[PDB]
Design a protein around this ligand. Structure first.
Ligand SMILES: *CCC(=O)Nc1ccc(CN(C(=O)Nc2c(Cl)c(OC)cc(OC)c2Cl)c2cc(Nc3ccc(N4CCN(C)CC4)cc3)ncn2)cc1
Length: 299
């Protein structure tokens, strides 16, 4: 019933300079790059995604209707759209997240990740999801891979390719609630499950969930009542929370609002809840003169 008032911005190819490739695909390629508004006299670090010059007519809509979604969100913990460019290929411009994949990050720095950092991440992702909740929105594919590191302190949620309005009608599996796997049913509560799994990924420094098992069986497994194991670093209090997420009755599952709160609690005495060897001996980090961050651009 509410009207989507989101502004969608068109940019000119001359306002942005592609610098280097971050990802490549049959679908297209994504560039680390910069964008300079014509008036603005500010440089903004962007990720530019450009569909391959050959364009699939079905394919093109595919990305627009993603940009439609991104455009509709404004949040600290949600990767916002900067704009799009109607070049012969259509180019999509979002905010650059320099450290990239959270999944990768924790794999690359498993030795260096503070207990506090993880708890911080957990919250932040909960703040993210509780926002998508508020905006009546269901991510439908939450995973460690789909969270992006702007800076170690800050992460933002991403890849709402599958996002749908709650109750709307129209496969990781491992991250997907049981309700979903049998019934293709999705809810915020369904997302809470995939949140649980996400936390597990982090608390195991980026380990594969259910490693070994073909995704086929999982459905049965969960009926039996089995879930993932408690990670080594995890106190029962943290694990206990993850488990709550994995209940079959989704009304028993916690609310992203609650999770924010509970991890926020634990955020304050990190070492009370995560045991990491040498916790307090760990720390994580051409002409960038006029450069500014997107989060700092709000016309
Ligand atoms: C670990 C899995 C992974 O790398 N996922 C992943 C990698 C790279 C990108 C590129 N980015 C991106 O696609 N953003 C983006 C865009 Cl452009 C659109 O347009 C539709 C939509 C959505 O959401 C659907 C998203 Cl997320 C991207 C990346 C970054 N930062 C970034 C920096 C570096 C790296 N990187 C990869 C790993 N090597 C080792 C180091 C460099 C990755 C990402 N910021 C903004 N967009 C997307 C997803």
């Amino acid at each position: 019933e509410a009207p989507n008032q989101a502004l969608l911005r068109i940019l000119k190819e001359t306002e942005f300079k592609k610098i280097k490739v971050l990802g490549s695909g049959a679908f297209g390629t994504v560039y680390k790059g910069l964008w300079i508004p014509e008036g603005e006299k500010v440089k903004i670090p962007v990720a530019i995604k450009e569909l391959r010059e050959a364009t699939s007519p079905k394919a093109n809509k595919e990305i627009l209707d993603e940009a439609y979604v991104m455009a509709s969100v404004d949040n600290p913990h949600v990767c916002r759209l900067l704009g799009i460019c109607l070049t012969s290929t259509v180019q999509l411009i979002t905010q650059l997240m320099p450290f990239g994949c959270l999944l990768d990050y924790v794999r690359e720095h498993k030795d260096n990740i503070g207990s506090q950092y993880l708890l911080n991440w957990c919250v932040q992702i909960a703040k993210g999801m509780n926002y998508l909740e508020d905006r009546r929105l269901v991510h439908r594919d939450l995973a460690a891979r789909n969270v992006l590191v702007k800076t170690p302190q800050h992460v933002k949620i991403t890849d709402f390719g599958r996002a749908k309005l709650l109750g709307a009608e129209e496969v990781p599996i491992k991250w997907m609630a049981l309700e979903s796997i049998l019934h293709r049913i999705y809810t915020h509560q369904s997302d809470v499950w995939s949140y649980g799994v996400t936390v597990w990924e982090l608390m195991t420094f980026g380990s594969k969930p259910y490693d070994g098992i073909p995704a086929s069986e999982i459905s049965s497994i969960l009926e039996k009542g089995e879930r993932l194991p408690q990670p080594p670093i995890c106190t029962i209090d943290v694990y206990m929370i993850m488990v709550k997420c994995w209940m079959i009755d989704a009304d028993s599952r916690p609310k992203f609002r609650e999770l924010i709160i509970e991890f926020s609690k634990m955020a304050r005495d990190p070492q009370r809840y995560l045991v990491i060897q040498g916790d307090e001996r760990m720390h994580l980090p051409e002409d960038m003169d006029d450069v500014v961050d997107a989060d700092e651009y709000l016309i």
